[PDB]
Amino acid sequence: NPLTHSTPKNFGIGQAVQPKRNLSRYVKWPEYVRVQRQKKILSIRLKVPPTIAQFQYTLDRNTAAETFKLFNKYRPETAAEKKERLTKEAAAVAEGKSKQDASPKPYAVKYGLNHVVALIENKKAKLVLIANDVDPIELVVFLPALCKKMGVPYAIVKGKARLGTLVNQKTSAVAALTEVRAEDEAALAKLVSTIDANFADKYDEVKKHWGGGILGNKAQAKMDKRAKNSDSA
Amino acid sequence: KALKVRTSATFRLPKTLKLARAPKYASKAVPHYNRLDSYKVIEQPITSETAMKKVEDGNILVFQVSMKANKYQIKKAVKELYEVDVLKVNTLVRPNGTKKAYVRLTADYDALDIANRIGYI
Amino acid sequence: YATVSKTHKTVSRAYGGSRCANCVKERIIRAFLIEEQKIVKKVVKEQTEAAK
Amino acid sequence: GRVIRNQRKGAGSIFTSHTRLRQGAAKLRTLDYAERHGYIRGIVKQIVHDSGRGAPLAKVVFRDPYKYRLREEIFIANEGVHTGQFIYAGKKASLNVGNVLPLGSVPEGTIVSNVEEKPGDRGALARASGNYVIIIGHNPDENKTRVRLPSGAKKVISSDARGVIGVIAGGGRVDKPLLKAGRAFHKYRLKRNSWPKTRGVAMNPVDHPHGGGNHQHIGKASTISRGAVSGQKAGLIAARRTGLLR
Amino acid sequence: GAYKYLEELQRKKQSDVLRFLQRVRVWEYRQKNVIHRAARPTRPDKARRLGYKAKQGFVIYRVRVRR
RNA sequence: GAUGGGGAAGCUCCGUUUCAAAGGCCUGAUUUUAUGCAGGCCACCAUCGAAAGGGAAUCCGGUUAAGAUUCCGGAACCUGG
RNA sequence: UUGACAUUGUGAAGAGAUCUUUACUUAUUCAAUGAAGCGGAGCUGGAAUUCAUUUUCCACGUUCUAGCAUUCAAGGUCCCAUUCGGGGCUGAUCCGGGUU
């Protein structure tokens, strides 16, 4: 207390070598980082046509959680289950003379983007989820147009990873239900009614809009102070 | 949620584990036997009048030693073959393309005594 | 110099084997009388607050 | 024909600069926070002679802001500086000889040297000895500044462009007759291989456009079009007038 | 199948959507090296009718030649 | 003069720290065992290029048909451990 | 050295029955640095002169001197289980991560 002294260090330029601060904003990133950050900035600055930007309207977290808990019931067989039931029918079918229909009718989510697209065309899809993902965007951009054309409900949900876990893949890019059990028959239509509203019923009016055109916020702040302070002196 | 704190603007490779080799097969499968050994280091003595005049005087053995041998391998294979102890080794490459060695045994020995033990004197 | 005792390479002042002892005499004068007048400057910045 | 002597300087073999004794590239300090929001003080350690140049250099030693050390830089020394001088650098610095300020910070009629074309090029204009630019006016909106280049041209630059106050040392240099071919030999050994110059008149039709003939004479006009092409250009190039002034 | 739709979309290269993608992509590549590794085809059905399969040992590279 | 990159049908050219995720240290943390995990660091970032430039340290006497500041005898010195 | 087409997107003014200005930024181009202090809002005074109350910009730790400035920072405060010391907040305003 008597012996301890109070230094204070004076950062007033001109003196006191600066302290260590957080430079996280200023660092020079790798050139792969800096590409994928400006590949986002450049899709925001440009004017994105109406058939893009119909993505980025995506099912919000509430109906999202409600949506998967329906599909989560219907997940396809795993490898082991298939491995397991390939023993049963072997022992079941050959012995008891049965026709190898001995197993129940499976009800599972349909996946793959060549299969689902062919389901929609024969109108066998009761719902469809779509990932705002798929960097090769052209794969997925006509689906809202077929669904709305063929009178199939559809949705756009964030991520192909979550769409991938219920199919047991890494990534998926689509999902569908062509069949549903009577316990979930009523729980199905409560999702559709909320899903038809925000996607397939807004489809026509969304095709007017052009997204993007958002200025970065050092440009936005200089625009405003020119656009505001023109008027008010 | 929040981000890191970097006190310096430089981003360098994160140091990631390096993994030692675990070869499936081996390389040459037979380790090569000792290439330069006791007997291949010193092939012959040197019998010329000038050579033999040091042996019988200055207690110095004079050998024709292989080209690949250095003063460490020589001092070691004189001790091993001929049993002696060595003060000093001096070497020169003769201008026929071979190397001569002047090996000076310690005062505990007489090179003349060992010189005639292997059959030259 | 790697072979030599340290008394050959040094003198026993501060800044021994480096500055010429009249360059140490100054930078003591200059370190004392600059941070002397520098205290008188910081009271005037307390007075210039209350004086105005 | 042959390839002439001025076409032969481009490939730059024996024509490069003689760089050995040069103290370094004389520049101003990198433009940073401390200098554009305030000032930072160095002191000039020694003002010294640079080879190949006509003007002395000064070495001022700053203190690095973000790391403990000293950093010393090479300024072309303005006339009147002296070792032991404090040299202040930054927006809020003061108007005195040797202090480097932005040009917007100085009144019109101020004499500065080693001024920058664009902010942060570490100096361009008026670096030769005795030269200076004058600040003749400002343009506080869409910020510019009106300065008079040492030739007499009037250029308009940014107002964030720094420049150092005063005249560059080494004035009066060309007042002294050179007097002999030896002293011009010791001049260009430290610069480059330009010297001596054989008159293109005195060489053959291969060596030059002016060569040949049973008398020494050019034979066609010595003024050449700006739209001439490689190797045609020798003599007075694209001149608007010619001949002794009156 | 889904590849008869992608086929026709890439035959309209001045359509307002693809001339957006062409503009965002060409900026991507010009930052990358002149020859670099493509983790995945940009035209899955264009490569596929040329003999590409999706399996280990079919590799895609992206190459930029002066014009 | 490689590397990274950039041209070039190509042989190869540019450039030499350049639009680069370019590297291994000082020991504290261990007394299960040696080195995990630790804070801090330092950003100079190939190599080549001189028997006349820079540079760690050796002298006298004797000796051979022909070698010696090298061999002999004696008296020193430097460097790494 | 010029014109046209392509790179090449966003839209306003003014003349001519297409041109000249001029805006936007993200492409494209240039420049700097061991990609550190950008843009926006703030608090303190205060030039300011108040026609309701702030309308607005400037500010905002260093100038007799060839001294000195580095160890998560001393101080201040509070935690953890006191054990020697360690972890927080501030000292050093906050937000957007567009390196300028």
Swiss-Prot record, chain A:
Give one GO term, molecular function aspect: RNA binding
> Known SUPFAM superfamilies for this protein?
L30e-like
GO biological-process terms attached to the record: cytoplasmic translation; maturation of LSU-rRNA
PROSITE patterns found in the cross-reference section: RIBOSOMAL_L7AE
Can you say where in the cell this protein is located?
Cytoplasm
Q: What Gene Ontology cellular-component terms does the record carry? A: cytosol; cytosolic large ribosomal subunit
Description of how the protein assembles with itself and partners:
Component of the large ribosomal subunit (LSU). Mature yeast ribosomes consist of a small (40S) and a large (60S) subunit. The 40S small subunit contains 1 molecule of ribosomal RNA (18S rRNA) and 33 different proteins (encoded by 57 genes). The large 60S subunit contains 3 rRNA molecules (25S, 5.8S and 5S rRNA) and 46 different proteins (encoded by 81 genes).
* Role of this protein: Component of the ribosome, a large ribonucleoprotein complex responsible for the synthesis of proteins in the cell. The small ribosomal subunit (SSU) binds messenger RNAs (mRNAs) and translates the encoded message by selecting cognate aminoacyl-transfer RNA (tRNA) molecules. The large subunit (LSU) contains the ribosomal catalytic site termed the peptidyl transferase center (PTC), which catalyzes the formation of peptide bonds, thereby polymerizing the amino acids delivered by tRNAs into a polypeptide chain.
* Protein name according to UniProt: Large ribosomal subunit protein eL8A
Look up and give the organism this protein is from.
Answer: Saccharomyces cerevisiae (strain ATCC 204508 / S288c) (Baker's yeast)
Curated annotation (Swiss-Prot), chain B:
Keyword Signal on this protein?
Answer: no
**Similarity remark:** Belongs to the universal ribosomal protein uL23 family.
Q: Which InterPro entries match?
A: Nucleotide-bd_a/b_plait_sf, Ribosomal_uL23-like, Ribosomal_uL23/eL15/eS24_sf, Ribosomal_uL23_CS, Ribosomal_uL23_N
Q: Which SUPFAM superfamilies match?
A: Ribosomal proteins S24e, L23 and L15e
Pfam families assigned to the protein according to its UniProt record, in alphabetical order: Ribosomal_L23, Ribosomal_L23eN
GO cellular component term of the entry, any: cytosolic large ribosomal subunit
Which residues constitute the cross-link Glycyl lysine isopeptide (Lys-Gly) (interchain with G-Cter in SUMO)? 40
Intracellular or extracellular location(s)? Cytoplasm
Role, per record: Component of the ribosome, a large ribonucleoprotein complex responsible for the synthesis of proteins in the cell. The small ribosomal subunit (SSU) binds messenger RNAs (mRNAs) and translates the encoded message by selecting cognate aminoacyl-transfer RNA (tRNA) molecules. The large subunit (LSU) contains the ribosomal catalytic site termed the peptidyl transferase center (PTC), which catalyzes the formation of peptide bonds, thereby polymerizing the amino acids delivered by tRNAs into a polypeptide chain.
According to its UniProt entry, this protein's organism is: Saccharomyces cerevisiae (strain ATCC 204508 / S288c) (Baker's yeast)
Q: What is the lineage of its organism?
A: Eukaryota, Fungi, Dikarya, Ascomycota, Saccharomycotina
Question: A single GO BP annotation from the record?
Answer: cytoplasmic translation
Gene designation per UniProt: RPL25
Record's NCBIfam families? Answer: PRK14548.1
| GO MF annotation list | RNA binding; rRNA binding; structural constituent of ribosome
* Protein name per UniProt: Large ribosomal subunit protein uL23
Q: Which UniProt keywords apply?
A: Cytoplasm, Isopeptide bond, Ribonucleoprotein, Ribosomal protein, RNA-binding, rRNA-binding, Ubl conjugation
Q: Which domain of life is it from?
A: Eukaryota
Swiss-Prot record, chain C:
Function text: Component of the ribosome, a large ribonucleoprotein complex responsible for the synthesis of proteins in the cell. The small ribosomal subunit (SSU) binds messenger RNAs (mRNAs) and translates the encoded message by selecting cognate aminoacyl-transfer RNA (tRNA) molecules. The large subunit (LSU) contains the ribosomal catalytic site termed the peptidyl transferase center (PTC), which catalyzes the formation of peptide bonds, thereby polymerizing the amino acids delivered by tRNAs into a polypeptide chain.
- Top-level taxonomy: Eukaryota, Fungi, Dikarya, Ascomycota, Saccharomycotina
Within the intact protein, the region shown is 62 to 113 of 121
- Additional free-text comment from the UniProt record: Present with 23600 molecules/cell in log phase SD medium.
Q: Which organism is it from?
A: Saccharomyces cerevisiae (strain ATCC 204508 / S288c) (Baker's yeast)
Family (UniProt): Belongs to the eukaryotic ribosomal protein eL34 family.
Name it: Large ribosomal subunit protein eL34A
Location relative to the cell: Cytoplasm
Q: What binding partners and quaternary form does the record give?
A: Component of the large ribosomal subunit (LSU). Mature yeast ribosomes consist of a small (40S) and a large (60S) subunit. The 40S small subunit contains 1 molecule of ribosomal RNA (18S rRNA) and 33 different proteins (encoded by 57 genes). The large 60S subunit contains 3 rRNA molecules (25S, 5.8S and 5S rRNA) and 46 different proteins (encoded by 81 genes).
Swiss-Prot record, chain D:
Quote the InterPro entries the UniProt record gives: NA-bd_OB-fold, Rib_uL2_dom2, Ribosomal_uL2, Ribosomal_uL2_C, Ribosomal_uL2_CS, Ribosomal_uL2_dom3, Ribosomal_uL2_RNA-bd_dom, Translation_prot_SH3-like_sf
An example Gene Ontology molecular-function term: RNA binding
Q: What transmembrane ranges does the database entry give?
A: none
Q: Which residues carry this modification: Phosphoserine?
A: 51, 94, 158-159
Function (record text): Component of the ribosome, a large ribonucleoprotein complex responsible for the synthesis of proteins in the cell. The small ribosomal subunit (SSU) binds messenger RNAs (mRNAs) and translates the encoded message by selecting cognate aminoacyl-transfer RNA (tRNA) molecules. The large subunit (LSU) contains the ribosomal catalytic site termed the peptidyl transferase center (PTC), which catalyzes the formation of peptide bonds, thereby polymerizing the amino acids delivered by tRNAs into a polypeptide chain.
Q: How does it assemble?
A: Component of the large ribosomal subunit (LSU). Mature yeast ribosomes consist of a small (40S) and a large (60S) subunit. The 40S small subunit contains 1 molecule of ribosomal RNA (18S rRNA) and 33 different proteins (encoded by 57 genes). The large 60S subunit contains 3 rRNA molecules (25S, 5.8S and 5S rRNA) and 46 different proteins (encoded by 81 genes).
- What protein is this chain from? Large ribosomal subunit protein uL2A
Organism phylogeny? Eukaryota, Fungi, Dikarya, Ascomycota, Saccharomycotina
